[PDB]
Design a protein around this nucleic acid. Sequence first.
DNA 1: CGGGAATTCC
DNA 2: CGGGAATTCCC
Lengths: 293, 296
Amino acid sequence: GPYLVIVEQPKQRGFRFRYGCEGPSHGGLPGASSEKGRKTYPTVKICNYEGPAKIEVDLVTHSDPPRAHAHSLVGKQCSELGICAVSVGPKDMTAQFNNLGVLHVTKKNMMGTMIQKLQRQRLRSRPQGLTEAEQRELEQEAKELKKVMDLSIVRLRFSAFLRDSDGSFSLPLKPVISQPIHDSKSPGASNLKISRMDKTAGSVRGGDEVYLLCDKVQKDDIEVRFYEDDENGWQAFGDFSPTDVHKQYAIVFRTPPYHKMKIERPVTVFLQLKRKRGGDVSDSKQFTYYPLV
Amino acid sequence: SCTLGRLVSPGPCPRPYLVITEQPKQRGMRFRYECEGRSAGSILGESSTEASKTQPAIELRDCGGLREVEVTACLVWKDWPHRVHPHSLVGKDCTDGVCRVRLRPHVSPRHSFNNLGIQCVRKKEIEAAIERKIQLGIDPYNAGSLKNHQEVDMNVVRICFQASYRDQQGHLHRMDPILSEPVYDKKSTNTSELRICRINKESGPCTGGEELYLLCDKVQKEDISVVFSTASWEGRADFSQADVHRQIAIVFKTPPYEDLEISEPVTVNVFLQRLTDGVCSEPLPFTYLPRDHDSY
DNA sequence: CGGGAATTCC
DNA sequence: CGGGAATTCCC
């Protein structure tokens, strides 16, 4: 029956929110399993359908309780400031949103915005002429949310709707939400990737310097890690000393002593940057080892 | 027109004028906006020191016969039309991009400025900011040419000096303006001061081709080149903008020596040279090795 | 569909 | 204020 399912999920981290002074066409929110060679977009679907139908989709507040948001989703097929709605053929009951971007509203404006956006959810619909009464509440619910809506992480809310006879859509459905998406810019949200590193070949024990180049990272919430656990884990860091974090985009440290008791042939392990709180990561960088001499 | 002739009336004696004794440190001072709310800077003197850092000091010459004189520090461009620069100079006794000090001529003719700083106005103001000052009659050379050819160096400025004298009589003449050795903002990547902060190894075979890493301060990839200059030789590495990791790191390849292997190794200095103006940086210690070392 | 300059804020 | 970093804009 009223069942909906997000087939492909939106890339969680990597899409750069764009400011209005930047333009409406810098791209469309990609998908998790979307890479070069073959792109992929935030597709949803409907099982046990009832024929042709639409799918309103707006940006909600990351806070689990699905609520609005100041960042108005923008794109070709978008209600100017708000929801982007598409349709589906009788058979193809799955919607895919290629061109889909997000408008980043400034901190100094996420105020007058959200409030105004609220006025519409009120004054706009239902009887017109909103009374000074609501006005007060509007101003409340607005500011009474400013400090509980991460201006850098949003979730899509795919809300499907059918036609309730008389030839008119209005029959709601089960609006499901897409796992959060971190603004590719917000200091604490991008993807902890790693451009490249200095000396590739390590050593053996635990104490070797190597110049590592990376992407913007904060003075903490950062720490290098290497491993290869076909077992029940195994880790090792490098240097939690900030002094070595060169202007956000670089870190130099000393190789940790792997419990490589077996000083036999050379063993190559995995290496990848991680975030403390967020617990991000990077790709498989090859860090080989060698027999001391 | 001409009042008097070259009568030996003055005679190699009068004719007062001023002079910068200590220029304001070229580049290193972070201009600030009226957004960062500030009033006092820290500008130093061209040749200061992390220790007893000197300061912008100037004196007067031929101030004899004078009772009290007033100085007029103000910001103007850096080329021919030294128009009144939009950035206003803030600090003590600075009203509108201008500072004044009723320094007693005779009894110690010299003023060392302390809390002194600049204020950089956003670009979408620049012009109007020049109009405002204009209106308030501010232009040590009256040459305001707006709307046509602009391009104002929002990173550098010259602080003009207009020193007005005063005698008992009603003959308050004015000396001639003095310009400063251009000041460059530290916050600008293009004109900041260059500085390496670390490097891979200190020794590399003269065979070259060796790849070395390096950290630095924000530099412009599309305009910078690391060198291995020295007495008798000057060979600069090679790499591409692609190896300029986010303005704070370089991955270059040590160029071979000037064809040499003669016995034991010879040390050389390495530093950065901006492919635009030349400004070099504090050189770092590096060493070349005489080819291989086949032995026990 | 990224890089980094220009501004603000802590 | 210094010194750094987050934020908004402009190529």
